From Swiss-Prot, chain B:
Catalytic activity: Hydrolysis of proteins to small peptides in the presence of ATP and magnesium. alpha-casein is the usual test substrate. In the absence of ATP, only oligopeptides shorter than five residues are hydrolyzed (such as succinyl-Leu-Tyr-|-NHMec, and Leu-Tyr-Leu-|-Tyr-Trp, in which cleavage of the -Tyr-|-Leu- and -Tyr-|-Trp bonds also occurs)
InterPro entries: ClpP, ClpP/crotonase-like_dom_sf, ClpP/TepA, ClpP_His_AS, ClpP_Ser_AS
Localization, UniProt: Cytoplasm
Organism (species): Francisella tularensis subsp. tularensis (strain SCHU S4 / Schu 4)
Broad EC category: hydrolase
PANTHER family named in the record: ATP-DEPENDENT CLP PROTEASE PROTEOLYTIC SUBUNIT (PTHR10381:SF70)
Protein name: ATP-dependent Clp protease proteolytic subunit
Swiss-Prot record, chains C, J:
The UniProt record lists the keyword Protease: yes
Superkingdom of origin: Bacteria
Lineage: Bacteria, Pseudomonadati, Pseudomonadota, Gammaproteobacteria, Thiotrichales
Protein name: ATP-dependent Clp protease proteolytic subunit
Organism: Francisella tularensis subsp. tularensis (strain SCHU S4 / Schu 4)
Entry's localization field: Cytoplasm
From Swiss-Prot, chains D, I:
Compartment(s) where it occurs, according to its Swiss-Prot or TrEMBL record: Cytoplasm
This protein's record includes keyword NAD: no
Residues forming the catalytic site: S97, H122
InterPro entries the record matches: ClpP, ClpP/crotonase-like_dom_sf, ClpP/TepA, ClpP_His_AS, ClpP_Ser_AS
Protein name: ATP-dependent Clp protease proteolytic subunit
Family: Belongs to the peptidase S14 family.
Oligomer status and interactors: Fourteen ClpP subunits assemble into 2 heptameric rings which stack back to back to give a disk-like structure with a central cavity, resembling the structure of eukaryotic proteasomes.
Summary of the function given for this chain in its UniProt record: Cleaves peptides in various proteins in a process that requires ATP hydrolysis. Has a chymotrypsin-like activity. Plays a major role in the degradation of misfolded proteins.
Main location class: cytoplasm
An annotated GO BP: protein quality control for misfolded or incompletely synthesized proteins
Length: 190, 189, 192, 194, 193, 184, 184, 193, 194, 192
């Protein structure tokens, strides 16, 4: 049943954080993004050379909040290895893709989905225009980010994200969003 | 709630016999279409007599309203317009769009002009499509007001960037109307 | 209970509701809130009655708390524009735009029944947005405020400043007090 | 193409001749339910209509009302005093607050109640929220109204003012005989034949 | 939707709603709740019928759970006031004020169809506020209760004591029971009996 | 939740390598199971983990994360159904350690095809249909692998809701054993 | 997903290393909490820098100006770091950090605009409130000009409508002093 | 979530919420609306601090739009009652009852930071019921209005007449203006000035 | 593992020591806001607790309340009279209805108000809907309560009964000095030092 | 305001809320509505206090309008089942199931404070469905009605018929009246 259980001398998430495991789970918003960031900054101050394991199951959500996690992943000293444990959709896929070169995983049955930004505004034509312009920049920037981490040319990322584009894990490996798909801990690496 | 009855006509139908049509309240598909139909009827009854289109509207839907504007231009009759309260947004465009020399207001009317309002949510590609579209609509509304007012296009853009309220006398000075009328007996005309 | 009907025998039959029937006697009512619908329906009756007879008085019975200033000011202007004198008669309340309409009736022909309540006030408004737009709408309502005070000054004979002072807060008046102020001409208790 | 008869109009504009229209021919007018701007204005229109039809024939104003808006109701009271015809009032269920005012406002000696009616008098009710300045403005105003309505009831009942004040401080329910004794009505009536 | 019937007034021709057509035979319905709207409509019909002819019987068909006491007592008092005898007929339910109206019809002319439900009870009310005002309203509802019991006693022929006891809680009666009790005079099953 | 300060009841039972999925499968309930499994792994990578299930299913992606973690980690994850295992709940029960998929006698087990829903342009409708069909295919294939049954059988047998009692779920290969008492 | 322990909760641990977050809306609650933290850090050591991490779409001006003032009042330099969004009062607080110590991550969105407000009532009172918000609009513009080095008339022009800047644009404009891609 | 701070009571060790930690330095906050909950919490802190030491200054930080007059007047009266001087500091907004609280701090020890908004007004209220009861409540709010004006006059040094005029409608002041008016004694920008 | 200090507990069971807990050490108890079963029972528990800690030391019961449920509140009143310790009462904002009853219920000579407090007395409020029988039952009951609360206020204020009845018929607001003159409190107090 | 805490100094520190602290003095409260949650929590305290000491009295303070009869009757039975005497003390209201609980305290050890209100009544219920099921639930509540009347008869000493007559409608009693009826044993005003 549903609440965080506890351990001897800590909730479970606190116990796993001790092994440098961080979870993004569910929607990306100011609350969820800030918490991952507090956690990355904290692990970095505990040991700036040890790898961090960022486990992702998210449908995405707010771009400004998520791009904070993304930026923080790149900025801090440790490598941030990503692993998709369910869904990595939208901002969630971007964060997966954004993990350290060579160190992005997915479990076999996970789902990866990539798309263009959703937004929305209501008001004067002048302000609508302001807001549309801005979303078009962010669209370009996020495609540039995916082109960098994937290996794809920009125009390929653009065409492939015009609509929701869903991928299985192997397809996600093949496309460059992740590096390995892993199935058993004892198995050999690839 | 209750429209008075006269002779067997409802009061609006009886005034329609004197070629008077009202826009009252919001512009929407219902209220626009009722004006359009009355205008087509009045033309049908006599394509040469003037039609008197009394406006008291805060505006509303642009597509609905431009149908009325076009219908006023399309029909043979001259459509005199008369502000009896408020002519804002699509309201002021319809008022300004009446026949050369035959756009009136009563003294106490408020007239307000502005740029279009809109709203879209979805993908960035579609936001771009809708934004381009409302910008075209903004520019054309502006040209429509420059035409009827005799103001420069830059001047209209600038004076519609934010809500711009005018009293009757100011709306005349600006070219939105031709005359402020206080009394039926008094001149000119 | 809803408005009844009168049958008129013709050369068959004709039906009118009571208000339609009174309109034939040149009686027009404003009852309840002033909005686009109510104001416009008064305006139509007024234009109708002018068309039927440009020279005979109209009797415009008022029981209203006021409402929307632009709608009300159409009625006020229509009242001055048309040829007939519009005599005004307060039959319960005339507050806010209701008291402006009462006051704008024809000279000498502004009436209240004895127990009516008459109230005058400055306008009410509301806007939310950018400080730029707030300023625009604040300027506007202040210009409206001034115009309505000028209307009342004109019909009452009071100095504009007196109007300003006396409408700064709600100012309730009895009929005799409204007469003394110049908001109406006569308090009437009985038809003879 | 004669006008259809119905028991009751669904809408004000309906081109049909209803029971109320039928009885308005007999100079009968109803106030039924709450006094509000709608109900009060309908009474007024019908009273002015009846007066135009015949200024020297009685009008029968049948009242079943819990009261409501004092300004709306005082337009009815006023109109009843202003028109030439006598306005007889009859309570047929409830005459409370502005309802009882209207009933006691009838023509001298022509104020009636059916035997089982409830008549209640009281002081006015109001409500205001805002600044203290404005609260004082509204309180002063309701006090003048209270006093004016008390003077009206004193006038028509023959009670002196200080009795009306005392007896309206709280809701005061009266049976028909009591209302007659108090001077709110003139006659309690049980059948047409007596 | 209410059906229409067209009659040749000669004239030539007038439409009636089905209800106005039946009004021509001096039939009047109370159907549903007693409230200011329903009560007044009935009282208007009664006054109208009396103006049409003050001596002919009126047939007042009742199917009502009751409702407001002041509204319904207007109806009761108008029944007694007008010249015509008001026959009452229960055609489904006559409960609370409904049953008071049924029982107040003209002596010897109170009917029910055989399957109707007649129920009598004490009044319901309620009030909130100061203790002083609670008292005023309580005293008033006790006066109402007593007057209604006295009316039922008068029309049933029961003692006031018996009415009081039998109305303390909801008391449901079949038509034949109501007749025995004095709330109606006949149960009728068929027009030609 | 019964409560000593310095364990709750679940914490104590976690100390016996007992984990629960109780109620709907969603991002919250799936993730907490994943966290517990990974913790249990770090504490002893050979001792069995007892995964009690009582669930109508829920979000596929969340649950298929739990499925995958169950396969990935060292120790055997034994599954025990303790009331209901429907939809994603039966998938998780059927995914337990071979030889170690259990049910109490009275449980209900249900398998079906995936539910979803979508609103939008035809193009997007097509995209989403195309994807749920792949997911359908993939879950049938998982059921097929874990029960021994032919893909074909699974496809016919999950077309509409298929309810099984414990004995039927064993016979079908969604569980390995029905257990009634401790002493067996 | 709730706040992990490390005994502290993770924010409290970061507070001990002189790190403060404003995350989400500025209102009385969130602003006061920042004020309390700043006062506490100053008390602990009045000479050490404080690191104020911001991700906010702004909110209540008066609550926000309390934070601004406190940042200027206390002895420590308050370095500001935008870590997702800094809009309206957000950008004001970012821009109000210590000279030379205002940062953003590379992908942050920074947005400046005039104040939002509103009022309903008597004309006299609409006027009072309108004049009030015009003072607040002028004060904020003066504050932005002071910290950015722009002329007041430039600030006024550029905040008439929402003005979204990328982190490099924000730096050239003077709302921050550095964009930091990496180090610690 | 409220951050925690751990201090070595020696002891050995106790956790404080950030607010209880600042309470150790005799700092107390009113943040948001004045209501029974917020007022009472403040009054508890004040009484607590006075028990800890009756001579040391207390630092009462205010960021409030006001709210209930009875609740806030408890706070005011407790400020004046207790032995310690209650320094007041405006840290965003002090409106309505907020500004009364700010102005009632110890003489010479009322502060604002430079960007705060101080607003003074007359009381708000409302009531519905009988005319008699409307009168009672009106008289009572006029007494309240007068007493609050007299308090502001006392602490500002303004005439009662001036207070009355300047509170008739919302009156917004910048910090430096409030100081000039007598509602605070100093505007402070920096700790070391 | 010492107990954390907070300003205020988020929940009843929170293992933290708050400002109210701190002051309860000093024998201070608050009634803040509405009198209901929750708030009244908390006062009672704290009074019984304080009495168990020391039956011969004063308790300081600080009151800011608009009143509320009379039965809940009369349990507080009773408990205050039943326990051995003197219960001093202090008004710190509002003492209205059951709130003023509790304040005037304090120990002889130990009833206080801060200077700006509002004290209001009135008659009880109730409400019932149902059969006339049951309405009469509830009305009779509220009348007995009205009379009992009037006798309590007579006792503690020294006013005779007929004065309490007269002065509570409608809401009666009193400033602190007035409440002291009326005998609802003993002392108005402006600062600790006087 | 929420329940405060007491710190107990140990050999470090321990925290109790006030109710936990009073439970140590064998005081249990029923406050507000009787439902599954409230009744059960009383039952647990009662079983707890028996386990701590099977021989020392418990003090069960009652301020309740009643509520759910099945939940309440668990508390009543638990009261009789356990070894300790459960003394009952009415501290505001004891109505309906609240008055049953008060009345079921141990012989001689049923108390009210002087201003308490005690009310007794027949049960309330409600069902909608088929006439068959209506009948089943009507039979049931009548059997419940009878059982509760028998409980009150037993603890009061009144004849069952008197209980029946006196609960047919709500019957409000003052403390002295409740004592005279046998619903409690003593009205207490002061501890000595």
């Amino acid at each position: 049943n549903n609440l965080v259980p506890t351990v001897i001398e800590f909730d479970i998430y606190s116990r796993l954080l001790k092994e440098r495991i961080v979870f993004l789970n569910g929607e990306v918003n100011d609350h969820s993004a800030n918490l991952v960031i507090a956690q990355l900054l904290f692990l970095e101050s505990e040991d700036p050379d040890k790898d961090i394991y960022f486990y992702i199951n998210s449908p995405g959500g707010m771009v400004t909040a998520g791009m904070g996690v993304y930026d923080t992943m790149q900025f801090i000293k440790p490598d941030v290895s990503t692993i998709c444990i369910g869904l990595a959709a939208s901002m969630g896929s971007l964060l997966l893709a954004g993990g350290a070169k060579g160190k992005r995983y997915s479990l076999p049955s996970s789902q990866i989905m990539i798309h263009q930004p959703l937004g929305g505004f209501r008001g004067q034509a002048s302000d609508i225009e302001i807001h549309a312009k801005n979303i078009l920049r962010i669209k370009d920037r996020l495609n540039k980010v995916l082109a960098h981490h994937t290996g794809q040319d920009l125009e390929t990322i653009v065409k492939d994200t015009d609509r929701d584009n869903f991928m299985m894990a192997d397809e996600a490996k093949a496309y460059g969003l992740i590096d390995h798909v892993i199935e058993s801990r004892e198995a050999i690496i690839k």
